[PDB]
Design a protein around this ligand. Structure first.
Ligand code: EG3
Ligand code: HG
Ligand code: ZN
Length: 256
């Protein structure tokens, strides 16, 4: 099926997922000179104090940290959003090299990784129904650059040994996501999609201006993961990102 290889790679998604060439994909290049300062845009409201992490899973394209979204425990509001969005999972996109990995680019500049915190609009009742709405999901995008280690990310890094192959999961409780946030909540927002099939166009993207720094040895551990399941040929989990798509008249608004 779909992957990042030269045969099932992004250039091919359109064949099974026609929406691949739609009007509101995901990711895009953020042209900061053409982005519109919108003063009407409110400050983002992140309440992750009550977050309930459960587990970490290698799903064959990335590793996901799942959160209990049975109640308004970890939410997102404000910004360009109306209503409350619940956090369900976070995952990353990284590269083979430090000079690539992020999905979204800023003035053509690519970061070494990209953190996506996924939220769904509670008014729709479940994740499943939210993916059928144009205002269904809200993803908080965070760039990672190589520098100094991120204390808050180490617990994740250390468990990676346990879920090296596809389909493996490990208990992952009491993980506090507040540790992955930059200092500033300045952002860019635009109407987009999911960056992996089924590439559904129900995402409001919120890309933070300020990048978090992680160390070289932190990113290195991401790179030791496998796309494959146990007892199969080893294919290192690298370059699990989608190239920038055409903006097509959409406008990118800045909160700053
Ligand atoms: N019920 C079917 C259709 C149907 C109906 C009747 C009979 C057969 C089929 C249906 O519509 N299923 C829709 C499923 O929608 C779920 C979307 O996929 C789930 C996993 N993908 C994600 O959750 C996901 C989340 C975030 C990102 S990202 N990268 O942009 O941050 C990328 C992906
Ligand atoms: Hg949708
Ligand atoms: Zn993602």
């Amino acid at each position: 099926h779909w992957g990042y290889g030269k045969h099932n790679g992004p250039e091919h998604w359109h064949k099974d997922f026609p929406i691949a060439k739609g009007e509101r994909q995901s990711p895009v290049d953020i042209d900061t000179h053409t982005a519109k300062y919108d003063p009407s845009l409110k400050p983002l409201s992140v309440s992750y104090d009550q977050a309930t992490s459960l587990r970490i899973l290698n799903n064959g394209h990335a590793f996901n940290v799942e959160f209990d979204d049975s109640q308004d425990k970890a939410v997102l509001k404000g910004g360009p959003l109306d209503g409350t969005y619940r956090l369900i999972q976070f995952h990353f996109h990284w590269g083979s090299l430090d000079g690539q990995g992020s999905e979204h680019t800023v003035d053509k500049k690519k970061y070494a990784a990209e953190l996506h915190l996924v939220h769904w609009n509670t008014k729709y009742g479940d994740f499943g129904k939210a993916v059928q709405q144009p205002d269904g999901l809200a993803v908080l995008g965070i760039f990672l650059k190589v520098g100094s280690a991120k204390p808050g990310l180490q617990k994740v890094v250390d468990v990676l040994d346990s879920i090296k192959t596809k389909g493996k999961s490990a208990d992952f409780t009491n993980f506090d996501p507040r540790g992955l946030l930059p200092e500033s909540l300045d952002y860019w927002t635009y109407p987009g999609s999911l960056t992996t099939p089924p590439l559904l166009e129900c995402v409001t993207w919120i890309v933070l201006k300020e990048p978090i720094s992680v160390s070289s040895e932190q990113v290195l551990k991401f790179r030791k993961l496998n796309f494959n399941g146990e007892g199969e040929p080893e294919e290192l989990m690298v370059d699990n990102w989608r190239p920038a798509q055409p903006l097509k008249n959409r406008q990118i608004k800045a909160s700053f």
